[PDB]
RNA sequence: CCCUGGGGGGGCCGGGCCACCCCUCCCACGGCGCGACCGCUCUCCCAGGGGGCGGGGCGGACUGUCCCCAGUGCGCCCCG
C-alpha cells in the first residue's frame, strides 16, 4: 500500500576536503633536486669531518 | 582660304565628363605612431655568477639518506 520511496531533503552540508590532490609537475620536479642536494651534503661534510 | 567647270583644306553651336592647375567627402590597400579590449606569459628586472614577475594576506596543500630550516604549487583580492 505504499511503495513510492520519498527522498530526504538531503542538502544539509557544504563541506569538501578529505583526500590529497595530485601534486603538480613543478612540485615533484623540485622534490627531486631537493633530494639530490640532500644526498651530496651527506657525503661532502659527513665523510670529511 | 588656296591651287588649276575641277581639285585641296579650315570651320559653323550648345552640353557634360574618365579627366587637364587651387579648396572637399567615402571606401580599399600598405607603413609609422595611439587608445581601449581580449589572449599568452615572463624578458629588460631584482636580491660577473645567484634568484623571479614581484608584494601582501584570507589561506591551504605539501616537499627534504633529514642545511629544521630552507624550498614548491594552487584559489582569491589588488598593482607591474
Swiss-Prot record:
It is found in: Cytoplasm; Nucleus, Nucleolus. It is linked to Diamond-Blackfan anemia 6: A form of Diamond-Blackfan anemia, a congenital non-regenerative hypoplastic anemia that usually presents early in infancy. Diamond-Blackfan anemia is characterized by a moderate to severe macrocytic anemia, erythroblastopenia, and an increased risk of malignancy. 30 to 40% of Diamond-Blackfan anemia patients present with short stature and congenital anomalies, the most frequent being craniofacial (Pierre-Robin syndrome and cleft palate), thumb and urogenital anomalies. Belongs to the universal ribosomal protein uL18 family. This is Large ribosomal subunit protein uL18. It comes from Homo sapiens (Human). The modification Phosphoserine is found at residue 24. The chain holds residues 249 to 297 of 297 of the full protein. It comes from the Eukaryota. Component of the large ribosomal subunit (LSU). Part of the 5S RNP complex, which is a LSU subcomplex composed of the 5S RNA, RPL5 and RPL11. Component of a hexameric 5S RNP precursor complex, composed of 5S RNA, RRS1, RPF2/BXDC1, RPL5, RPL11 and HEATR3; this complex acts as a precursor for ribosome assembly. Interacts with isoform 1 of NVL in an ATP-dependent manner. Interacts with RRP1B. Interacts with IPO5, IPO7 and KPNB1; these interactions may be involved in RPL5 nuclear import for the assembly of ribosomal subunits. Residues 10-20 have a biased composition (Basic residues). Residues 5-49 are annotated as: Disordered. Component of the ribosome, a large ribonucleoprotein complex responsible for the synthesis of proteins in the cell. The small ribosomal subunit (SSU) binds messenger RNAs (mRNAs) and translates the encoded message by selecting cognate aminoacyl-transfer RNA (tRNA) molecules. The large subunit (LSU) contains the ribosomal catalytic site termed the peptidyl transferase center (PTC), which catalyzes the formation of peptide bonds, thereby polymerizing the amino acids delivered by tRNAs into a polypeptide chain.
